[PDB]
C-alpha cells in the first residue's frame, strides 16, 4: 500500500497473509474454512496466516493453517486478468475470535464514489521498493466505469473496477495482490492489477467480487 497508514494490530481481522516460505499475497477470510484471493496469486504449497499484524514477528494471535485445496476461477484468464479470483480451503477450520473473523460477501455491487478499505503488506513506495512488516491500510473511492475504461483503454471488463486517486500518491501495490477491498462492510474487491503503483492517471484495478457470489457459494457447497 503506497500513501496509506498503519492499520493497528488485528483491526482488519479478515485479512490473511498467504505464505510459501515468505509472504507473497493477501486474501480475505469469508468463513472458518475458506479464503478468497486473486487467481494470479496461485502457488502450490500455500500456508494461510490469520491474526497477523507484523508478518515477521510471532506476536501471539496468529493461526497458521495449511491450504488443502485451491480453486482458480474456471474462466480466469492470466493474460487479461479477467476473473482474477481464487478460493483457498483451509486444512482445518480457523478459530474465529475478535482478531480472526470473516468478512461478509456482498448482495449488491458497490456504488461508484464509495470509500473502501484496502489493506496489505505490499510495497509502500511508488518509485522504488520498501515492504512493511505491519499491515497497512488505505481508504480509496471506487471510480466510475467510464473513468476506469479511459485510464486503461481496451483492458477493463465488466468483472473489474478501478479505485483510488487519479492524481497519484495513494494505491495498493505489489504484495497486496489478493487482499481485500471492503466497502460498507462487504468484500467488494480483490487487489488485482494496475500500471505501476500510485502513478498519475493509473488507478488500481480490482476484481469485482459481486459478480462471483454465485460461483463462490456453489463451490463452497461442493468442496
Ligand atoms: Ca506475526
From Swiss-Prot:
Protein family per UniProt: Belongs to the peptidase S1 family.
Q: What is the name attached to this protein's record?
A: Serine protease 1
Among SUPFAM superfamilies, the record links this protein to: Trypsin-like serine proteases
Its PTM note reads: Subsequent cleavage after Lys-125 leads to alpha-trypsin. Further cleavage after Lys-170 yields pseudotrypsin. A cleavage may also occur after Arg-99. Not sulfated on tyrosine residue(s).
Organism placement in taxonomy = Eukaryota, Metazoa, Chordata, Craniata, Vertebrata
What gene is this protein a product of? PRSS1
Q: How does it assemble?
A: Interacts with SERPINA1.
Where is the protein localized?
A: Secreted, Extracellular space
Query: Which GO terms label this protein's molecular function in UniProt?
Result: endopeptidase activity; metal ion binding; serine-type endopeptidase activity; serpin family protein binding
| Record has Calcium as a keyword | yes
Entry-linked SMART domains:
Tryp_SPc
- Residues binding substrate are 171-172, 174-175, 177
Q: Which PANTHER family match?
A: RIKEN CDNA 2210010C04 GENE, TRYPSIN-RELATED
EC assignment: the record states 3.4.21.4
**Cofactor: binding comment:** Binds 1 Ca(2+) ion per subunit.
Q: Which residues bind Ca(2+)?
A: 52, 54, 57, 62
Main localization (coarse): secreted
Is Calcium among the key words of this record? yes
Amino acid at each position: 500500500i503506497v500513501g496509506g497508514y498503519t492499520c493497528g494490530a488485528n483491526t482488519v481481522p479478515y485479512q490473511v497473509s498467504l505464505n510459501s516460505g515468505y509472504h507473497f499475497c493477501g486474501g480475505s477470510l469469508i468463513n472458518s474454512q475458506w479464503v478468497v484471493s486473486a487467481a494470479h496469486c496461485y502457488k502450490s504449497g500455500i500456508q494461510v496466516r490469520l491474526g497477523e499484524d507484523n508478518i515477521n514477528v510471532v506476536e501471539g494471535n496468529e493461526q497458521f493453517i495449511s491450504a488443502s485445496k485451491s480453486i482458480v476461477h474456471p474462466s480466469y484468464n492470466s493474460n487479461t486478468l479477467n476473473n482474477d479470483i481464487m478460493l483457498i480451503k483451509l486444512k482445518s477450520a480457523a478459530s474465529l475470535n475478535s482478531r480472526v473473523a470473516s468478512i461478509s460477501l456482498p448482495t449488491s455491487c458497490a456504488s461508484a464514489g464509495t470509500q473502501c478499505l484496502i489493506s496489505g503488506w505490499g510495497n509502500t513506495k511508488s518509485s522504488g521498493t520498501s515492504y512493511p512488516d505491519v499491515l497497512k491500510c488505505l481508504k480509496a473511492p471506487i471510480l466510475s466505469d467510464s473513468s476506469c475504461k479511459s485510464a486503461y483503454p481496451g483492458q477493463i471488463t465488466s468483472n473489474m473496477f478501478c479505485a483510488g486517486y487519479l492524481e497519484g500518491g495513494k494505491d495498493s501495490c505489489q504484495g497486496d495482490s489478493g487482499g481485500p477491498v471492503v466497502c460498507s462492510g462487504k468484500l467488494q474487491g480483490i487487489v488485482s492489477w494496475g500500471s505501476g503503483c500510485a502513478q498519475k492517471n493509473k488507478p488500481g484495478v480490482y476484481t469485482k467480487v459481486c459478480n462471483y457470489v454465485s460461483w463462490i457459494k456453489q463451490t463452497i457447497a461442493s468442496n
